[PDB]
Design a protein around this motif. Structure first.
Motif, PDB file in Angstrom:
ATOM      1  N   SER A  73       1.002  -1.177  -0.102  1.00 29.66           N
ATOM      2  CA  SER A  73       0.303  -0.021  -0.055  1.00 29.66           C
ATOM      3  C   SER A  73       0.850   1.142  -0.067  1.00 29.66           C
ATOM      4  CB  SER A  73      -0.888   0.028   1.189  1.00 29.66           C
ATOM      5  OG  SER A  73      -0.158  -0.233   2.451  1.00 29.66           O
ATOM      6  N   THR A  74       1.683   1.395   1.022  1.00 27.08           N
ATOM      7  CA  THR A  74       2.591   2.595   1.166  1.00 27.08           C
ATOM      8  C   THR A  74       3.454   2.558  -0.067  1.00 27.08           C
ATOM      9  OG1 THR A  74       3.416   1.319   3.016  1.00 27.08           O
ATOM     10  CG2 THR A  74       2.539   3.434   3.331  1.00 27.08           C
ATOM     11  N   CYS A  81       3.862   0.945  -3.051  1.00 25.56           N
ATOM     12  CA  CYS A  81       3.270   0.189  -4.166  1.00 25.56           C
ATOM     13  C   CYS A  81       4.039   0.274  -5.378  1.00 25.56           C
ATOM     14  CB  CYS A  81       1.639   0.551  -4.383  1.00 25.56           C
ATOM     15  SG  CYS A  81       1.569   2.314  -4.665  1.00 25.56           S
ATOM     16  N   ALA A  82       3.491  -0.491  -6.460  1.00 20.18           N
ATOM     17  CA  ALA A  82       4.225  -0.319  -7.768  1.00 20.18           C
ATOM     18  C   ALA A  82       4.023   0.955  -8.338  1.00 20.18           C
ATOM     19  CB  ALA A  82       3.825  -1.701  -8.695  1.00 20.18           C
ATOM     20  N   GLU A  83       2.779   1.567  -8.128  1.00 18.32           N
ATOM     21  CA  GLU A  83       2.442   2.950  -8.565  1.00 18.32           C
ATOM     22  C   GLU A  83       3.793   3.760  -8.382  1.00 18.32           C
ATOM     23  OE1 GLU A  83      -1.463   4.057  -7.722  1.00 18.32           O
ATOM     24  OE2 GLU A  83      -1.448   5.826  -8.696  1.00 18.32           O
ATOM     25  N   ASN A  84       4.496   3.767  -7.320  1.00 15.24           N
ATOM     26  CA  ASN A  84       5.809   4.566  -6.927  1.00 15.24           C
ATOM     27  C   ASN A  84       6.495   4.571  -8.303  1.00 15.24           C
ATOM     28  OD1 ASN A  84       5.798   5.677  -3.945  1.00 15.24           O
ATOM     29  ND2 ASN A  84       4.582   3.819  -4.133  1.00 15.24           N
ATOM     30  N   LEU A  85       6.351   3.536  -9.039  1.00 12.72           N
ATOM     31  CA  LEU A  85       7.255   3.666 -10.379  1.00 12.72           C
ATOM     32  C   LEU A  85       7.093   4.772 -11.052  1.00 12.72           C
ATOM     33  CD1 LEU A  85       6.672   0.000 -10.532  1.00 12.72           C
ATOM     34  CD2 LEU A  85       8.870   0.774  -9.954  1.00 12.72           C
ATOM     35  N   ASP A 121      12.264   9.339  -9.634  1.00 18.78           N
ATOM     36  CA  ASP A 121      13.138  10.150  -8.544  1.00 18.78           C
ATOM     37  C   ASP A 121      12.283  10.068  -7.201  1.00 18.78           C
ATOM     38  OD1 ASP A 121      14.976  10.726 -10.584  1.00 18.78           O
ATOM     39  OD2 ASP A 121      13.618  11.992 -11.643  1.00 18.78           O
ATOM     40  N   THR A 122      11.946  11.291  -6.841  1.00 20.53           N
ATOM     41  CA  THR A 122      11.098  11.457  -5.634  1.00 20.53           C
ATOM     42  C   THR A 122      11.692  10.600  -4.633  1.00 20.53           C
ATOM     43  OG1 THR A 122       9.615   9.705  -6.760  1.00 20.53           O
ATOM     44  CG2 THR A 122       8.723  11.785  -6.609  1.00 20.53           C
ATOM     45  N   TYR A 123      11.164   9.522  -4.118  1.00 17.18           N
ATOM     46  CA  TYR A 123      11.973   8.898  -2.893  1.00 17.18           C
ATOM     47  C   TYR A 123      11.238   7.508  -2.798  1.00 17.18           C
ATOM     48  CZ  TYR A 123       8.048  10.673  -0.453  1.00 17.18           C
ATOM     49  OH  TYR A 123       6.801  10.994  -0.091  1.00 17.18           O
ATOM     50  N   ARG A 124      10.544   6.775  -3.834  1.00 15.65           N
ATOM     51  CA  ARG A 124       9.877   5.453  -3.467  1.00 15.65           C
ATOM     52  C   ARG A 124      10.105   4.609  -4.670  1.00 15.65           C
ATOM     53  NH1 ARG A 124       9.709   3.353   0.890  1.00 15.65           N
ATOM     54  NH2 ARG A 124      11.166   5.087   1.792  1.00 15.65           N
ATOM     55  N   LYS A 125       9.972   3.229  -4.288  1.00 19.63           N
ATOM     56  CA  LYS A 125      10.257   2.365  -5.643  1.00 19.63           C
ATOM     57  C   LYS A 125       9.079   1.346  -5.589  1.00 19.63           C
ATOM     58  CE  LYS A 125      14.567   2.998  -3.813  1.00 19.63           C
ATOM     59  NZ  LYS A 125      15.908   2.608  -3.229  1.00 19.63           N
ATOM     60  N   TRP A 126       9.382   0.275  -6.045  1.00 15.55           N
ATOM     61  CA  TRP A 126       8.336  -0.923  -6.218  1.00 15.55           C
ATOM     62  C   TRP A 126       8.616  -1.796  -4.785  1.00 15.55           C
ATOM     63  CZ3 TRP A 126       8.011  -6.057  -9.189  1.00 15.55           C
ATOM     64  CH2 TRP A 126       6.944  -6.600  -9.169  1.00 15.55           C
ATOM     65  N   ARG A 127       7.690  -2.123  -4.290  1.00 14.14           N
ATOM     66  CA  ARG A 127       7.797  -3.170  -3.250  1.00 14.14           C
ATOM     67  C   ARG A 127       6.582  -4.288  -3.172  1.00 14.14           C
ATOM     68  NH1 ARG A 127      11.593  -0.691   0.308  1.00 14.14           N
ATOM     69  NH2 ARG A 127      13.082  -0.491  -1.116  1.00 14.14           N
ATOM     70  N   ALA A 128       6.842  -5.519  -3.008  1.00 11.62           N
ATOM     71  CA  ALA A 128       5.953  -6.604  -2.992  1.00 11.62           C
ATOM     72  C   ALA A 128       4.908  -6.290  -2.139  1.00 11.62           C
ATOM     73  CB  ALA A 128       6.629  -7.915  -2.891  1.00 11.62           C
ATOM     74  N   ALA A 129       3.679  -6.683  -2.142  1.00 12.35           N
ATOM     75  CA  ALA A 129       2.652  -6.573  -1.300  1.00 12.35           C
ATOM     76  C   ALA A 129       2.894  -7.221   0.272  1.00 12.35           C
ATOM     77  CB  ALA A 129       1.289  -7.202  -1.822  1.00 12.35           C
ATOM     78  N   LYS A 130       3.806  -8.417  -0.095  1.00 12.63           N
ATOM     79  CA  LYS A 130       3.907  -9.091   1.239  1.00 12.63           C
ATOM     80  C   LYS A 130       5.701  -9.334   1.349  1.00 12.63           C
ATOM     81  CE  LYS A 130       3.283 -13.707   0.498  1.00 12.63           C
ATOM     82  NZ  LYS A 130       4.069 -14.186  -0.705  1.00 12.63           N
TER      83      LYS A 130
END
Length: 151
Positions: free
Chosen positions: A17-18, A20-24, A28-37
């Motif tokens: 949620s925090t 998520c792949a949408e961060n792709l 830049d910014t400061y977030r990447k993709w992370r599995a749901a679990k």
């Protein structure tokens, strides 16, 4: 310009949620993709392309992952999620050793024309399936650091 711009994550098969792949959408910014679990054994995420075009080169960075496969497809039909062709098989950048002795835990790689099928790469697609693969986590999640397509 001669490049590729993502719009939103059309399909998600491993996103939290925090982080998520949408961060792709914000490399830049400061977030990447992370599995749901956690227990990152294999994660998939289909991103939408802000424009149906052909793919000649790509730049995606692995965030602890090792195998990265990318498929291509269009918005034709609708939410099918079963009409994409293997533009480029899984790319092995790292392995489960980085998860053991920090052997390059964060690396990146690109996929030009040699890494993409010509019968499909030259076909105008507007949807892409990104799937990472390598069992290295268990309690903490992970995934990719960014994804940048370029025609």
């Amino acid at each position: 310009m001669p490049e590729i711009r993502l719009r939103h994550v059309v399909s998600c098969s491993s996103q939290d949620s925090t982080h998520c792949a949408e961060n792709l959408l914000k490399a830049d910014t400061y977030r990447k993709w992370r599995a749901a679990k956690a227990g990152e054994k294999t994660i998939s995420v289909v991103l939408q392309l802000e424009k149906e075009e052909q793919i000649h080169s790509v730049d995606i960075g692995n965030d602890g992952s090792a195998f990265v496969e990318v498929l291509v497809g269009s918005s034709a039909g609708g939410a099918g999620e079963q009409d994409y062709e293997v533009l480029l098989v899984t790319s092995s950048f790292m392995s489960p050793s980085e998860s053991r002795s920090g052997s390059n835990p964060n690396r990146v790689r690109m996929f030009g024309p040699d890494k993409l099928v010509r019968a499909a790469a030259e076909k105008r697609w507007d949807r892409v399936k990104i799937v990472c693969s390598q069992p290295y986590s268990k309690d903490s999640p992970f995934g990719l650091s960014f994804v940048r397509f370029h025609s």
